[PDB]
Assembly symmetry: C3
Homo-oligomer: 145 residues x 3
């Protein structure tokens, strides 16, 4: 159509308007094709996971420096550590994303991970570096869509 | 096109991102094809109606158990009763949606409706059950889009 | 397709749902094809400009009476003057939009603009009328998308 193309413009325009409003007001962060957001709650790993999937997203996990920095700023903003979408329950010391694939990008705080098999989750410090941790602490719920 | 299909993916993806953010942050509830939301205001029936249409939606009305429960949770959350998008002004005892069609799904509190012709509106209790009421009370404004 | 048309309906519907939620909750104002929004911050001209572009929009500028009134209501709501997307730095007394084009619609407060070359920005009073001003004051950041 010709009508299809102007309908698409309008749709794309309106999308960027809503994204713009949410962005301007700090409701979320856009990094490439990824949108990060938090409900401000501090809960444990399993709770965060459910909150995120209930909203149609997933517990956030950084796969690039820019994505890592985005999540870091939210952690900084809320002054709380953040549980990341990765665990090493399956095999010890081998952290994997929740789809089962092995993590590639890492930003471990020097010396980490250590403490080992008692600590199967990953938390992000407010400077963006990571620490392996037990999964029952109260951490800021950050989701990716 | 081939380009059309990847443009559509992207558009659909971005939509679900904005919906995800609004959902995660409690700005609205998605139930099937219906989105519920409130501005937190307690006003009378006529005012709610205007607020909702000004936003491009309508005063909420539940047509299923799940929809009813969704509105109920908002009522619970704000600890206030909710005016529903239905009245019986036309014929007495015959409640109709605002398009004029007769209500099908009901969730009357036992004994309701009673009091009759002096009470042409419907309010939802915080447990989700309904009570027929005068239309001039201050009730939580919940809209559907 | 036939499938394309029902996919488009759904997409358009969901867009209006998110816009409806943002609108109902006062997160933004829709005027024709333009969406206005604020982050509530009072900062100077250069800062507002950056905030708006970071969100994928621009510092707001009214080109119609309705658009002017929309921005005015936000100014009223936040009880603060608003920097508008226009300056007269290039040539003195000749105010232009930030794309360089000359402003057409104006709503100067009677007597304005005056003070002249020391005042290259434009602020909106809470009644919607304009005043030319220095660019270093703290004003409400209102963006258009
Ligand atoms: Ca272990
Ligand atoms: Ca471990
Ligand atoms: Ca550790
Ligand atoms: Ca009656
Ligand atoms: Ca009645
Ligand atoms: Ca009654
Ligand atoms: Ca000058
Ligand atoms: Ca000047
Ligand atoms: Ca002046």
């Amino acid at each position: 159509d010709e009508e299809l193309q102007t309908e698409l413009y309008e749709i794309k325009h309106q999308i960027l308007q809503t994204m713009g409003v949410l962005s301007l007001q700090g409701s979320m962060l856009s990094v490439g094709d990824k949108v990060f957001s938090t409900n401000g709650q501090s809960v444990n790993f399993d709770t965060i996971k459910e909150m995120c999937t209930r909203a149609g997203g997933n517990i956030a996990v950084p796969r690039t420096p820019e994505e890592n920095e985005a999540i870091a700023s939210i952690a900084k903003k809320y002054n709380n550590y953040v549980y990341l979408g990765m665990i090493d329950d399956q095999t010890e010391g081998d952290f994997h994303y929740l789809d089962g694939a092995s993590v590639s990008y890492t930003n471990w705080y020097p010396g980490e991970p250590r403490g080992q098999g008692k600590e199967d989750c990953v938390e992000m410090y407010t400077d963006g570096t990571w620490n392996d941790r037990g999964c029952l602490q109260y951490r800021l719920a950050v989701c990716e869509f």
